């Protein structure tokens, strides 16, 4: 929200460079669940977290693509079975 | 402009492959259509 | 007398040039070193420094005092901060003049008041004209796109230096409107929060016809609104 608040001033490249590195471990986290579907978090910054195979949990950055990741990992994890 | 959708286009192409494989995996191999 | 006046004009109040809000800077007028002969020169120089203190005070008060947050364009808001940002950059030659002055006093310490009045004559008319242009904006709580019109009408004057000077700040405020418009027409993404940039699927947008700047007629704004609604729809 700090990006959309101020984007036409001198603090625009510094804030963009801050947000671009504040999401760098997040891309590794997503870079797991796109190809394998193995849980990685011990920080509480991840919202895809730990019957009929829907007993893992799921709860601003774009929530529109997160649920897609939650199901795109679980297919690869289904072919492990 | 603030957009994070430029990365979604090199990602949705794999999202679609995974989804199509998931629906195909039931019917041609586990034979839910026969049941 | 020498460094003291440059101290006062820079925006830190002097002890001889006592900072008041109702008389600005005023020379102490009680020394047996001063006289009607030199007093008038000091008052004429003090006009520019009083305006400069007010300028820096307003710019500081409204640049970098919040995360841009609700906010109104008379107090908060992107347009007013853009005005302060442009106002600092037009004031850069005055800073250069004061810095140059101290170097000349270092080269020879015997220079008179006529030299500094003579060099600073070109600012002597430029500061009073722009002062009321910003004063009307501050007093009336002018919100939204009307700020651009308010400085725009007095940059339709008959004084060339004031025209160039006000036109620079107006370019700065256009920049923030244009930065928000460069997404919304082509994506639909507003980048403006709690201010007006004169446009607000199948609907959900409407033209703010009342706020729309006078040099931007209603016809072009309808094409803008059409483009935004369409890109939102598909």
């Amino acid at each position: 929200q700090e990006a959309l608040h101020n984007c036409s001033n001198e603090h625009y490249p510094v804030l963009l460079s801050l947000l671009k590195t504040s999401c760098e471990p997040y891309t590794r986290f997503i870079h797991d669940w796109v190809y394998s579907g193995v849980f990685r978090d011990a920080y509480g910054e991840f919202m895809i977290q730990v019957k009929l195979y829907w007993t893992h949990g799921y709860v601003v950055f774009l929530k529109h693509i997160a649920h897609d990741i939650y199901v795109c990992g679980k297919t690869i994890n289904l072919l492990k079975l | 402009v603030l957009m994070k959708r430029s990365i979604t286009a090199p990602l949705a192409a794999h999202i679609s492959l995974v989804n199509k494989a998931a629906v195909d995996y039931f019917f041609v191999e586990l034979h839910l259509e026969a049941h | 007398m020498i460094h003291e006046l440059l101290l006062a004009l820079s925006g830190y109040p002097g002890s001889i040039f006592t900072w008041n809000k109702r008389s600005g800077l005023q020379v102490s007028q009680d020394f047996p070193f001063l006289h009607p002969s030199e007093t008038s020169v000091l008052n004429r120089l003090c006009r520019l420094g009083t305006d400069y203190i007010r300028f820096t005070e307003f710019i500081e008060q409204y640049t970098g005092h919040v995360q841009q947050q609700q906010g109104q364009g008379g107090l908060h808001g992107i347009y007013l901060r853009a005005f302060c940002t442009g106002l600092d950059s037009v004031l850069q030659p005055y800073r250069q003049a004061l810095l140059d002055l101290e170097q000349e006093f270092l080269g020879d310490p015997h220079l008179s008041i006529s030299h500094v009045n003579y060099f600073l004559d070109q600012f002597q008319l430029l500061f009073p004209s722009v002062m009321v242009v910003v004063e009307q904006i501050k007093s009336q709580k002018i919100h939204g796109c009307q700020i651009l019109e308010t400085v725009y009408k007095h940059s339709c004057g008959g004084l060339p230096p004031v025209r160039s000077a006000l036109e620079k700040i107006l370019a700065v405020c256009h920049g923030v409107m244009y930065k928000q418009l460069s997404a919304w027409m082509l994506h639909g993404l507003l980048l403006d929060q709690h201010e007006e940039f004169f446009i607000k699927s199948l609907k959900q947008f409407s033209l703010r016809v009342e706020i729309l700047p006078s040099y931007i007629p209603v016809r072009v704004a309808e094409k803008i609104l059409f483009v935004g609604e369409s890109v939102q729809m598909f």
Side-chain angles (χ1 to χ4, degrees):
Chain A
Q1 305 164 138
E2 199 45 62
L4 288 179
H5 284 348
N6 183 225
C7 76
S8 182
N9 201 11
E10 63 196 12
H11 322 295
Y12 175 55
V14 178
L15 272 173
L16 186 72
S17 317
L18 280 164
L19 171 64
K20 273 296 194 78
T21 196
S22 156
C23 310
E24 290 302 347
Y26 189 78
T27 46
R28 302 200 320 255
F29 282 17
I30 300 304
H31 193 274
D32 311 337
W33 281 70
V34 167
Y35 306 136
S36 87
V38 185
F39 178 58
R40 173 196 189 163
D41 176 62
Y43 310 98
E45 64 196 41
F46 189 54
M47 48 185 281
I48 303 173
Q49 62 89 39
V50 54
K51 71 171 175 175
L52 76 163
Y53 191 69
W54 281 116
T55 47
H56 302 103
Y58 180 84
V59 181
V60 58
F61 183 74
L62 293 172
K63 308 170 268 185
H64 301 163
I65 306 296
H67 180 60
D68 291 331
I69 303 297
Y70 169 53
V71 69
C72 276
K74 286 183 71 149
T75 291
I76 303 296
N77 194 210
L78 184 89
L79 301 169
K80 310 290 177 188
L81 308 163
Chain B
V1 55
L2 273 300
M3 48 184 312
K4 313 283 183 175
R5 203 164 44 178
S6 310
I7 302 176
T8 310
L11 183 71
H14 182 89
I15 292 178
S16 44
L17 194 63
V18 163
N19 282 12
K20 181 68 181 294
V23 188
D24 173 53
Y25 169 70
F26 293 127
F27 303 133
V28 298
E29 186 185 337
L30 273 47
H31 302 302
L32 271 77
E33 186 175 356
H35 303 156
Chain C
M1 286 78 78
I2 301 300
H3 182 62
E4 172 74 57
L5 187 46
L6 303 183
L7 190 150
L9 302 164
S10 280
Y12 301 129
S15 44
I16 306 306
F17 304 97
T18 54
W19 176 239
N20 186 27
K21 187 56 72 72
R22 335 187 305 276
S23 63
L25 296 169
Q26 182 63 253
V27 318
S28 93
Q29 274 307 123
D30 43 19
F31 293 112
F33 308 136
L34 63 81
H35 265 293
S37 51
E38 73 190 20
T39 293
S40 36
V41 188
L42 296 167
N43 301 132
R44 268 181 187 84
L45 299 172
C46 276
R47 308 175 185 182
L48 313 167
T50 296
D51 304 346
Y52 198 79
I53 295 168
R54 295 276 205 114
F55 294 156
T56 42
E57 165 174 278
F58 166 80
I59 291 161
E60 189 275 333
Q61 178 169 14
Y62 292 121
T63 313
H65 65 101
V66 68
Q67 300 300 120
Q68 266 196 337
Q69 307 277 354
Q70 185 44 232
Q72 307 293 311
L75 299 156
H76 308 131
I78 186 157
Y79 279 95
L80 165 143
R81 184 177 282 178
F83 201 100
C84 307
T85 296
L87 194 57
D88 195 19
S89 46
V90 297
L91 283 168
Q92 176 70 272
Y94 193 78
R95 314 174 139 193
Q96 312 160 355
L98 265 68
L99 295 177
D100 171 270
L101 273 161
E102 183 62 55
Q103 170 76 41
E104 302 200 282
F105 282 117
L106 302 189
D108 168 51
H110 304 306
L111 296 182
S112 74
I113 61 175
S114 82
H115 282 270
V116 64
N117 184 19
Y118 153 69
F119 289 132
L120 275 294
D121 203 8
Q122 65 178 356
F123 294 100
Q124 190 61 263
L125 75 165
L126 172 64
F127 279 13
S129 67
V130 299
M131 179 70 183
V132 287
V133 183
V134 308
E135 175 68 54
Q136 298 179 34
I137 299 172
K138 293 195 305 185
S139 45
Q140 302 169 39
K141 318 298 295 184
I142 297 172
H143 162 65
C145 320
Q146 300 301 99
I147 299 169
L148 322 180
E149 284 193 68
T150 310
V151 72
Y152 175 50
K153 296 306 173 175
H154 313 137
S155 52
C156 306
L159 296 158
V162 197
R163 172 160 198 115
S164 316
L166 297 176
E167 179 162 18
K168 301 310 293 307
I169 300 170
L170 195 50
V172 184
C173 314
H174 288 104
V176 314
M177 185 268 319
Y178 278 136
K179 168 64 74 69
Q180 299 150 337
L181 186 52
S182 44
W184 184 92
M185 262 206 283
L186 263 177
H187 298 70
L189 300 188
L190 75 161
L191 307 182
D192 193 13
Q193 286 71 240
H194 51 259
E195 292 295 312
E196 282 174 288
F197 68 122
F198 57 81
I199 44 96
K200 180 153 62 56
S201 281
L202 311 158
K203 194 31 208 67
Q204 308 306 128
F205 301 148
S206 313
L207 163 66
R208 308 151 156 154
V209 71
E210 68 274 15
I211 197 64
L212 177 64
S214 48
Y215 54 94
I216 300 170
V218 62
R219 196 262 321 167
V220 201
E222 285 159 36
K223 310 290 167 297
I224 298 287
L225 180 69
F226 165 80
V227 160
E229 274 215 359
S230 89
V231 70
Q232 181 63 47
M233 282 153 57
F234 55 78

